[PDB]
Design a protein around this nucleic acid. Sequence first.
RNA 1: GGCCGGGAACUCAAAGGAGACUGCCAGUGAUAAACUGGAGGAAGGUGGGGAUGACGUCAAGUCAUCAUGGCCCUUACGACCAGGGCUACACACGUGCUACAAUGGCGCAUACAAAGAGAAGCGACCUCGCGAGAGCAAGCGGACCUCAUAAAGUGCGUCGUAGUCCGGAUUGGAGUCUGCAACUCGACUCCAUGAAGUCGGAAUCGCUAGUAAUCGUGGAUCAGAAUGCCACGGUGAAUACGU
Lengths: 115, 127, 152, 83, 98, 100
Amino acid sequence: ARIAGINIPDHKHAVIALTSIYGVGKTRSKAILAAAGIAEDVKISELSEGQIDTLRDEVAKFVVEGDLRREISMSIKRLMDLGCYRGLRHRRGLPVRGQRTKTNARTRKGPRKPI
Amino acid sequence: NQYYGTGRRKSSAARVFIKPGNGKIVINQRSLEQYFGRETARMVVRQPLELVDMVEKLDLYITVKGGGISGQAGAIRHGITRALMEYDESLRSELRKAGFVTRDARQVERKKVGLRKARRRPQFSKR
Amino acid sequence: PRRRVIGQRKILPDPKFGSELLAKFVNILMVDGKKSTAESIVYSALETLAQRSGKSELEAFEVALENVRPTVEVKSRRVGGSTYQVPVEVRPVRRNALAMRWIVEAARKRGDKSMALRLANELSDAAENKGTAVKKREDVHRMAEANKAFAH
Amino acid sequence: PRSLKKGPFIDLHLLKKVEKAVESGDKKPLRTWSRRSTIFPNMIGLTIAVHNGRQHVPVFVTDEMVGHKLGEFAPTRTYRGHA
Amino acid sequence: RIRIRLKAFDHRLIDQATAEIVETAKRTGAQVRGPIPLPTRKERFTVLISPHVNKDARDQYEIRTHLRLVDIVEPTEKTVDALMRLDLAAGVDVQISL
Amino acid sequence: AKQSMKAREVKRVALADKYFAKRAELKAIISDVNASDEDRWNAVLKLQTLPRDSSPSRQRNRCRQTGRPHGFLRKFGLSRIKVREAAMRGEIPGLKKASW
RNA sequence: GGCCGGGAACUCAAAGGAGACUGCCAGUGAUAAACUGGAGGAAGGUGGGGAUGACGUCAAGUCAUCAUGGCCCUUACGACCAGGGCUACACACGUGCUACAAUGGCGCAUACAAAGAGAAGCGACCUCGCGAGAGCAAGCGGACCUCAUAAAGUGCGUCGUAGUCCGGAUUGGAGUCUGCAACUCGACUCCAUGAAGUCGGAAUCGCUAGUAAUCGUGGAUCAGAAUGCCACGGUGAAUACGU
Ligand SMILES: [Mg+2]
Ligand SMILES: [Mg+2]
Ligand SMILES: [Mg+2]
Ligand SMILES: [Mg+2]
Ligand SMILES: [Mg+2]
């Protein structure tokens, strides 16, 4: 119950449980779970240490959790300091992908501000 | 010899051949239970033959086209009624009273200009 | 309406019981036109009630329905321009419709895992005078009794 | 965006201007209108003034901006705030 | 075998042409099968009748295209010669295919 | 509309039909899967040189009688107002008001 | 394998006819007009839906579809080209789509429609790629071929009330297609992330039967770009004492 530096739930199936890793989704969960031949209908509570080690070996094949987040920051930071249009849209807390701004855009702006 | 009947309901048309027999029913090369999953359709199909009590003495070969499950079942009922009344006219008074000889003329109304549906109007604001 | 033209529309008894009452109850429980999903729940609830009570399969439903039917309701009438609360009689069809609707709405507000189980509980309670439909009927009865002086 | 097989897009006149400028030695910023052209590693270290609707904005090409369009470093809308 | 298709916008001016072509192909000394009534095509259009705004005011028009088919089995060498100068009605399209 | 708009439309049509074969040939080379990289680059640079109005996507459908750029119908070549006015005088063959 | 020879019976196709007219019976009614019930019949009293809008009112809308009196400009209020803007954003309002779940989500298997478009076009089979798509390439100016497998539905299993195996907004990376040209400012695919949202205050809307509600399909516009508009089918309700 210690994979990729985080704790994982024990009472759910493997496919549901492994997606809790930052960077591992449902497709990635299935790929990892099938790469070592473990069924999707087994709780990790009842499972042995050797195949846990194999699961760790297979999940160690991607940039996940903190090692991912790092470059994401630079992926944003290089955009901000370069001075491009996306950097300016990032600075002001406004949409970057050319959506509406006359209305909506609450998620990028937050709750309404009474004057 | 063979007796023939036809039935129409919604966009569904069915044709039925009835012969003296023992109680065999065929619908598009499939059994009665292999075609209609819902028991309501089976009951509405078997209504008239059960009412006249000629269930185990006749054989039925049926073909259908168009519409859906309920429309096809209603077409089957209409066709069975027409074929049976063709076989014997003495039941003319009975099948009519059971509400089967009358052809169900209800249809689907079109879409009109300015409305989202046949009669549904858009939302209205006074001011 | 202004014309008195409308009439009664024919209904088909349900297949495996031949009862119009079950047909009407299924229609009341139906949503979105998905009938096939309605009689499934109705049948599951009916069989669960039949096995739980052990009295019958259809008589338990009839007894629960009878326990809830009211006989008086309240409407508004006027004589000199002032509105009132006047008690009036209920026709049998209206009694059955009100009872079924109250039972359905009471069932829809619970915390179980299936709708058929909620239906089983509500019909059981109605047959043994514990459901909220009993409270509805009693409150209607007592509001009708309170406004008794205005009965012409 | 654009297909991978087609390759990057650039205007002929701009390409000739920048190649001549690089060959002849570093010069003054090049005045241009084509905001839709892509930036090249050849264009590194030169200054290009690009149109934005009413003016020409100088931009100095750095190494990190290779791969984008010339129109992403010159805005066209002016906004300070509300009230 | 020669099959002929006939198209028209009206169901009366095409019936006369069909009758005349079948009766004239009968006389040359061949056998004719038909005519075959084929499904018509309905094309519907809708337009706005106001020169400015007034969205919910429209006219709906339609165009009906009729269709007939005839066949000739084992024709005469003179049947085609006779049919090359039939001079059908103006407003009917005729298509011949061997 | 104006006269200048129709003049621009006709000039665009003429230029578009003048350069059909050359543009088709250049687009065929560009879309080709197996070709030299320098050949593709030169073909792109050559296609970029041809006038913009030669592109058949620069044209806008306009009414034949008035020139209106909105409410166009391809089957008739006229806007809705012109189609209605012509059709109600029995000048479009076979067209009549529908009902069902 | 209607697959073949065959057949014109059936469905259907498209032309012409029949039928429904208070026609018949009984009662009331001023013998009438008319109303009520009944026989028969597929349909009974305007069978269902559509087109059809009197004389006029609002000095209602449109001089930017078009036409037109008067006034106004004429090396400019006329004409050409490139780039930008019509897509901005502390805010308020109208009309919609997706949800807040168990009558449900997810996986596998299995049935039943109507209507319409296609020549600079619809583009099948086969091969390649996880996918959007790519290569090669028959048929079709069409009751022939393509678009193009309907979905809800049914059987089995899993989920067991959790902001969840509900929700898919936002954001990063990698791509496909159209078009000279996807930065401002296109559409779609894969991987990664996973916001508000637990049924909505004062108020307010639509609908009388194949109607409301719910699920799918097509077209015009158009190089590319629908949650809008115009059409087509599947399932299929509750209630109307009375003014
Ligand atoms: Mg519908
Ligand atoms: Mg009239
Ligand atoms: Mg005015
Ligand atoms: Mg005005
Ligand atoms: Mg311009």
